[PDB]
Amino acid sequence: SMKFIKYLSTAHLNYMNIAVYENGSKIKARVENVVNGKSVGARDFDSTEQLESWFYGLPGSGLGRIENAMNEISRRENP
Amino acid sequence: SMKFIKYLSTAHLNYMNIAVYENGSKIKARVENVVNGKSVGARDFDSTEQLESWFYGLPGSGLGRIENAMNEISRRENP
Amino acid sequence: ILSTASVLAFERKLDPSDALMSAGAWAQRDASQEWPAVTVREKSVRGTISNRLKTKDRDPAKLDASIQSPNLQTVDVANLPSDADTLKVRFTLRVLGGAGTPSACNDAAYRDKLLQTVATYVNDQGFAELARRYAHNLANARFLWRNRVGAEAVEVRINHIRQGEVARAWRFDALAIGLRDFKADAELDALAELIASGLSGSGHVLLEVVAFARIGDGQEVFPSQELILDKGDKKGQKSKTLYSVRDAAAIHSQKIGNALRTIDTWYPDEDGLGPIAVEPYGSVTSQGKAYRQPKQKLDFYTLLDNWVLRDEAPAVEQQHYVIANLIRGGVFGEA
Amino acid sequence: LSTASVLAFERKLDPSDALMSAGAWAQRDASQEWPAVTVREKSVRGTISNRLKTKDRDPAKLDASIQSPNLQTVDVANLPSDADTLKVRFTLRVLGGAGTPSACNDAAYRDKLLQTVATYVNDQGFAELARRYAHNLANARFLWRNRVGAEAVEVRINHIRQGEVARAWRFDALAIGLRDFKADAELDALAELIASGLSGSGHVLLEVVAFARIGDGQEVFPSQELILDKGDKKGQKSKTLYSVRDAAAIHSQKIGNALRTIDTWYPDEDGLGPIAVEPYGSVTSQGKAYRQPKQKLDFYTLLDNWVLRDEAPAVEQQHYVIANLIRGGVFGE
């Protein structure tokens, strides 16, 4: 049960974007290929306010900022 | 009574290869030094068909695959 | 007795080089020595998600959001300059010779049995049909893959180069010479005899092939495309990449080598596709179809294993096919 | 007398790595400045070509294999599109003292080996072996596949006495054969230089330069590297060519193998030709080891007969044993 909310950008980059799912009281951000749904990395979040404070805290402006977001999520999170 | 069949590769790696012996109705795979016959680890098998389905199921291609095979056999099998 | 050799290998004959593209104007191709190279640029594209969408189990809001949003890629493009309509493509070809002899073989009885079989094939007839069909693939412009599609005129110049000086020059028309029928000509027979004497081992054959394909001003040309594994975390935005050399767009050598050996007109399925390329299990990847299937008995491995081992010859055209797979080269035997 | 438990021989005729570079024919006289051939990188989409197991000879499995990708990345080395020849240079030291082992246990086996090699040298010099090594320098055996299908090949050999060259040679690698061994004036002069070098009576330093007129943009063949295609990220390049800084190179041992292709008395036949000098003399590229130890022509058999029991073999097998000692190796148990 992961209800879709919105894509994180206005434009897709290379058929790649960040989808936003509501996973219970948490909230999900998956790096997905838009034509077939293959995820290449996700990260857990809880509130949309802190998610936007994290996203707008990234360096960049627009598609460069979501490039930074997909490079951040698309690496393996360290133990 | 362990009749030799074939080596598992075309080339030796570091004077090391995998020899194949027919041990009764079973079949043996020994990690042997080719110049003196010192085994450093063996593993029991029964059929050549399942042995090839195990070997071709290993990750790699060629000498990297038999490197994976010798690293798999050359460790002590867990109880 | 006389089982197959567990290691067979044939190095290839008919060695091409990479073909460098350059652009210029027609009726100045008689002085086309100094034409500037076609450069690979890099532009940005914005499109739509217009692929077959999996509308079997999906949220409709996600499907509506995915197709109402644009896609912002970056591609490599190769155009002509705007004051030039003719594309030049230049590559060299060496025809080695000594086709029957393998470069790796376990058995010594299978090896000289194979050598006697290929000596019988060279004895009862030359390489005349095979070299005739390779000279047809040089005479038209198969190596201009999409650059031939929709052109006013294509002209192919072929030079025989013995020393620094050119020894023998041909000049053709790739649109008059067909794409499907293997007709006859005097200079096609001369070029075929030169290629056949190269394959037999008489002289040293070096060929320069220059193709002029008039397209139009500023149109897109099509170099061969590259592979961008393990760069999605560095670049990410760039999706298409063209093969180049030190500042010139170029086609790969193996693709021209595939274009030269599209000869096989004897595959049993049909004749409506024309010739296909000489392959073991002779197949086309665009068709997605394994023509020359191994459950019928026209497979290359089956014809080899009964024309060498069991001493039973196939028909003459299947013999031409087997010697074409030996001229092609490849890693035979069991891998 | 029993042979020692540890034997060793350092190699003589040790070459350096070749350095390939490309330029123009009839400009090879001024060739100290040619740009080196670089190892570039291209992409290959393969096909289904190996033998099927005949349990997978179905229509749908072949169609799925043809729709499956087989994308790879390989290294290639080509000439520039205006260059038509290949310059290859390397240097070669000729040591001498080719009977003394560099490690031995038995002081009696050592002295017996010394006077056995000494009575070989007193019976006949290094003249036949140096004749055959001068032949493998004369033709272009170290151009392995680069020679195969070349317009004209030419080999320049200089003797380096000081900073200045002392003696020069100019050869024709195609007229000088690949199948037999002949005589010529400059060949015998080079053979006598190598024979003076192998007997410890001088210091010989040779640089050898070879030119092979191939064609514009053709594929040269540097030596290929061993890479283990294991399960890393997404698959790497599947063909690595050996190189140095900004230059494609042939290994030193490949040239050293192409120099010692001498042996014509392995007991199979004379129909094939000369093979490389080797204990259990094996052409591994055709999967067959000639000179099996089941006959009486193995190197260890000839050594243990002709040093311990003092029975001499034929003169041709004496040439074989002394070429094995010039090769070097790990001998003994």
Automatic annotation (TrEMBL), chains A, B:
Xref: Pfam families: Acr30-35_AcrF1 (PF20829)
This protein is called: Uncharacterized protein
Lineage from the top down? Viruses, Duplodnaviria, Heunggongvirae, Uroviricota, Caudoviricetes
